[PDB]
Amino acid sequence: EYEQRLKVLEREVQQCSRVLGWVAEAL
């Protein structure tokens, strides 16, 4: 189960990085 939860958390960190890069250099 650690691979599933860790893939979910890495997806969340990737989404937060994309949103922060969006609010920084896309708005």
Minimum Å distance from CB 16 to its own copies? 6
Q: Is 24 helix (H, G, I), strand (E, B) or coil?
A: helix
- Window 1 to 27, contacts with its own copies (CB under 8 A): 2-3, 5-7, 9-14, 16-18, 20-21, 23-25
Minimum Å distance from CB 8 to its own copies? 11
- Contacts for 3-10: CB closer than 8 Å, 24+ residues apart: none
What torsion do the CA atoms of 12, 16, 19, 25 make, to the nearest 10 degrees? -140
Q: Which residues bind its own copies (CB under 8 A)?
A: 2-3, 5-7, 9-14, 16-18, 20-21, 23-25
